[PDB]
Amino acid sequence: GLSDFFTQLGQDAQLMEDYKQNPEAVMRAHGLTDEQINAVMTGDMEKLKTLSYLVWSH
Amino acid sequence: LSDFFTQLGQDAQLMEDYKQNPEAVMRAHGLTDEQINAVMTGDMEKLKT
Amino acid sequence: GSLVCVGTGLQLAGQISVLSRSYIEHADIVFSLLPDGFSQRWLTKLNPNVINLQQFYAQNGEVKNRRDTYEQMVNAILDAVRAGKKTVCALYGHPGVFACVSHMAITRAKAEGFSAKMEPGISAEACLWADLGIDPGNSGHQSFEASQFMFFNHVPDPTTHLLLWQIAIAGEHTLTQFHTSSDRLQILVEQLNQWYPLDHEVVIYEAANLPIQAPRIERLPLANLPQAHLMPISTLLIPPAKKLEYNYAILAKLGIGPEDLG
Amino acid sequence: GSLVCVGTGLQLAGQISVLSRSYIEHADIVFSLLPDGFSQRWLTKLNPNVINLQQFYAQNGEVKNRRDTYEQMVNAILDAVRAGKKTVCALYGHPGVFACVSHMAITRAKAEGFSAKMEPGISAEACLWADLGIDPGNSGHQSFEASQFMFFNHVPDPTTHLLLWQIAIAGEHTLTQFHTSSDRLQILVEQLNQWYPLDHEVVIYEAANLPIQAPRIERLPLANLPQAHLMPISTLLIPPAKKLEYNYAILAKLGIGPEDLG
Ligand SMILES: Nc1ncnc2c1ncn2[C@@H]1O[C@H](CSCC[C@H](N)C(=O)O)[C@@H](O)[C@H]1O
Ligand SMILES: Nc1ncnc2c1ncn2[C@@H]1O[C@H](CSCC[C@H](N)C(=O)O)[C@@H](O)[C@H]1O
Ligand SMILES: [Zn+2]
Fold first, then answer.
1. How far is C177 from C169, CA to CA, in rounded Å?
2. Interface contact flag, B9 C213, Cβ < 8 Å
3. Residue D92 designated active-site
4. Are C219 and C201 spatial neighbours (Cβ–Cβ below 8 Å)?
5. How do C141-145 and C50-52 pair as beta strands?
6. Residue A49 Cα, ligand 1 centroid: separation in angstroms?
7. Which of A4, B18, C109, D201 is the most buried (most CB within 10 A)?
């Protein structure tokens, strides 16, 4: 549910511009729970996931 | 010509097929001999005029 | 109205990001600035409402400051925004990488109270790492605009890969000429000679624009740069003149030595 | 069997090239190194025959040189190539920027007579310019890995935008830890003080990996850096500290001055 939405939102500029205008509305419409929405609005990436180095000096 | 390049640049199946056999793939997309000659000599101008 | 500047990459059609293409497709209007007519066609098939910014460049042996060129570009872009059109600026490569138009158009847009953003694209730089198989993190990376490096005081680190962009107009102050002179590039060689020997191999790089085209990767001694054939899309790569040497100073502070490095 | 190394950019799903996406789609097998589980689900939907390189990182707090992680990655990729699989390596951002797994795989593949190439992608640096509305051309640009900057001799130009990648492990010489100490960071500050004052505003930048995520753009005086909260994805931007001094020497050879500068 959550993953599907994010995937689409990243690819689809229409939906992105729809999301920018009204994030809660768009999210509610895509089935996101309050906790999921709250985490989005508070930037808690940590929670969202719940619900790197490839080199050196020499 | 402008149609073949758009496909090729977007389509990694066509790309890989092209790199297998540039001429065969170009001929199969109806490119002329001078067009193909312009590709193989890497002359972008003559392709663009 | 809103602004979104995107980049189309260097290669035809396939080097644009998925999101960035979807923005062109859903725009009300598109202002293009693409390297050729093949990419300009592709664009038009994406979205037929395009105004080509190329028109604002000097036309017909005309002397025009490139500044005045960009102004008009920004202004035309803003006009569609202020009319209420969902506007997109489709520039080649990365919209904000050595690209003044977009940064100026986003700024002006935000200050007049409009929604403006920049979406990153694949730049000439990004193409250079992949074509040459060089990693900018290997011994570091510096990039400067050839003329800015010639006009002001810039100290390069000769252990890094050095880039000079717009090498083809290196030293062209007026901003009216499409190319530079041999004697301009010769003064660049003598300048560079503070850090690089005359026989130092450098690379003239040109990322392909077409899928049937190989890149230009021309290696030559620094000394032969003034006799080289340079194009507006030419970037100059100057590999390290020196190898990485240990920083005993800091290693000491860190209480370690070379042997201690993993 | 052949090899194509591509990038998926920073942002989920949208920031990869159109061509690169197609490469993943048509691949026999994909070896991934992606930021998170969302990016990993998207990939798996794109092509189900994925092998996740993340596994080769130290598991359960074991001591393991990252060199040995990279060697294993590289060897897994080549194992598929050698078997005769059309193999794709998908790394986040640009596959060959500050990432040695792609360059090594490509190098080794060629030497064994396999076809191998790199497709450029969008990097964290591409992302930065856009997010902080900075044109790297404005006053030019420098990049270094933070630890190499400390362990080796590098002099930055203080008139340019300076980046220190992998700041979260600055001075972690063992390459077995995921982060450094505040004492290391303090040594970095003292070193950077050769050029930048202590109150010099620096920026902790992190490009978003998700569409609903704002980027981190945390401004603080340089002195405060050692107390700052840093993450593996964190990049440190050090903005110019100094005025461009006129290269009067070169302007003269050009026979011009500031006033003539267009
Ligand atoms: N195809 C190409 N190959 C190599 N360098 C190129 C190039 N196109 C542009 N450049 C470099 O960029 C300069 C113009 S600045 C515009 C660059 C563009 N924003 C990008 O994404 O790269 C040129 O003078 C040259 O130095
Ligand atoms: N989301 C992000 N925001 C900022 N910097 C990031 C980042 N992801 C990676 N980096 C930088 O890159 C380093 C990892 S190396 C991988 C770089 C990646 N291939 C690219 O193209 O950018 C990090 O330590 C940090 O310096
Ligand atoms: Zn760079």
1. 8
2. no
3. yes
4. yes
5. unpaired
6. 39
7. C109
Say if residues C102 and C117 touch (Cβ distance below 8 Å). no
**Residue A42 in domain:** yes
Q: What is the resolution of this structure in A?
A: 2.2
> Of all protein residues, whose CA lies closest to atom 10 belonging to ligand 2?
D233
Q: Is C247 on the interface with A (CB under 8 A)?
A: no
Pocket test for ligand 1, best of C148, C166, C217 (most atoms within 8 A of CB): C166
Q: Can you tell me whether residue D7 is helix, strand or coil?
A: strand
Between CA C53 and CA C76 the distance in angstroms is: 9
Q: Does the residue A57 lie in any domain?
A: no
Residue A35 covered by a domain = yes
d(CA D232, CA D166): 6
**D66 flagged as catalytic:** yes
**Closest ligand by atom to D129 CA:** 3
| Pocket lining: C165 vs ligand 1, CB cutoff 6 Å | yes
In angstroms, the CA A15 to CA A25 distance is 12
Experimental approach:
X-ray
Question: Which residue from C10, C118, C231 has its CB within 8 A of the most atoms of ligand 1, so it is best to mutate?
Answer: C10
Give the pairing type, strands D235-238 and D2-7: unpaired
What is the domain range of residue A28? 2-49
Give Cβ neighbours of residue C168 (< 8 Å, ≥ 6 apart): C179, C180, C230, C231, C232, C234
- Number of domains observed in the structure of chain A: 1
Question: Are the beta carbons of A10 and D35 closer than 8 angstroms?
Answer: no
C21: closest CA among D38, D11, D15, D126?
D15
Domain assignment present for A21: yes
Matching residue, tokens 């730049």: C123
Residues in chain A: 58
